[PDB]
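User: These chains co-purify. Model them together.
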Amino acid sequence: RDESDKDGMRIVIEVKRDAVGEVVLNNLYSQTQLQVSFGINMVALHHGQ
Amino acid sequence: QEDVVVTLSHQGYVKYQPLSEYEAQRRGGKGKSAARIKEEDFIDRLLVANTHDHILCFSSRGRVYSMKVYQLPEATRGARGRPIVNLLPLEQDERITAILPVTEFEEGVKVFMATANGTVKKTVLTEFNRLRTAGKVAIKLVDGDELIGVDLTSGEDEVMLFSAEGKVVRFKESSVRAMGCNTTGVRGIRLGEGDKVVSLIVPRGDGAILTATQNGYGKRTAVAEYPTKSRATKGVISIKVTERNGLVVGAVQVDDCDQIMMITDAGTLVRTRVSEISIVGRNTQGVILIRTAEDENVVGLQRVAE
DNA sequence: TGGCCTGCAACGCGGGCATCCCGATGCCGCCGGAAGCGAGAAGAATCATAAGCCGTAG
DNA sequence: GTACCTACGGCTTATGATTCTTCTCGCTTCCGGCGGCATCGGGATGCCCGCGTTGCAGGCCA
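Assistant: Joint model of the four components:
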């Protein structure tokens, strides 16, 4: 479901009955794009080079 | 690191506590009021290792379980601990045979096993690198076989197999070649009709070998008298079997200052110092240790780890 | 503050010696049962290949 | 009024290939039980004598 409005984004996910939810949440964190890396790379011009 | 000691009780309660607390609780003598309880519980296995090391739980069905030390219940949140059958996936009538603390997965360390049908087997510790709590098959058992003895053998150590008919064999582990985990193994002792292996002792030090019979008769014999024959050959005389003695219950290596545990079919527990037993040779019967009625017999011999 | 350890004198029976019977045992001939080595088969896993988005440019 | 294409560079994820784990075919041959008989060492049974076990009471220890 979804409950987002003009007071803040809110996403609601119904957990299946008879489930801890923490293992499912970890599987999501491992698979869902909620955990992504970042390619830090500091390159710029100092005297045009 | 937190050097702890792991104490497994006779009823199957596993737990551990730090060495400082264990030595503090050990100070003093045991109360004689508790010794009058015939249905009490005592420590079965004792070991000291690191909390980050791995333990190998060996069952009688040929399965081995690998788990960490910190997964066991601590001294807090319960004094007696938790049953081992509720934390390990053990089947019905599946009892734990032996537990071997392992610090490093050394290639030179081998896990020697022995079955009831005389089939022995050793496995390189390297093959036990990655094993979960579910466990795997450590030895292939035939119909009517069970695992009875597991010990770590390496270098030039020897192994000994004990029988109920008074036979015993002693051979070096160099005459055996390792195999896979899902194989049967090699044969180590001659067994007669209806006879099986009862115990295993690896010679370490100068401790004497203490054996016993069903009717409470036992003796002691030094290891310097036991010949060193080949594997799966005829066994030398261990004890004179007689209708007054019965089948051999078991044998455990004991020093001159330790204790032995003797249990009967009724439930009588008897603690006897080893100094009250005469020292005799191999081709002997022994002396009288405890009384025995015409309808009871000793069913278990074990060295007190206290 | 209560119980374990030990000196001591009196009661008690087991250790030591002698011996014939018994059950393990070595040996020999005979029968059988894992085995284990090589070989074949199955499952598990890490390297290699084709974009997709990020924002300007045509 | 609106839609569809690629270059400039990096990580990943969506799928066919190779080393490590495992499942278990083959029987046969040297080897390990298995039974019978002569053999030998132990010991249970009997008697004698001193030492191991135990009760009482005191001083020491957990």
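Chains B and A do not touch (no CB pair under 8 Å).
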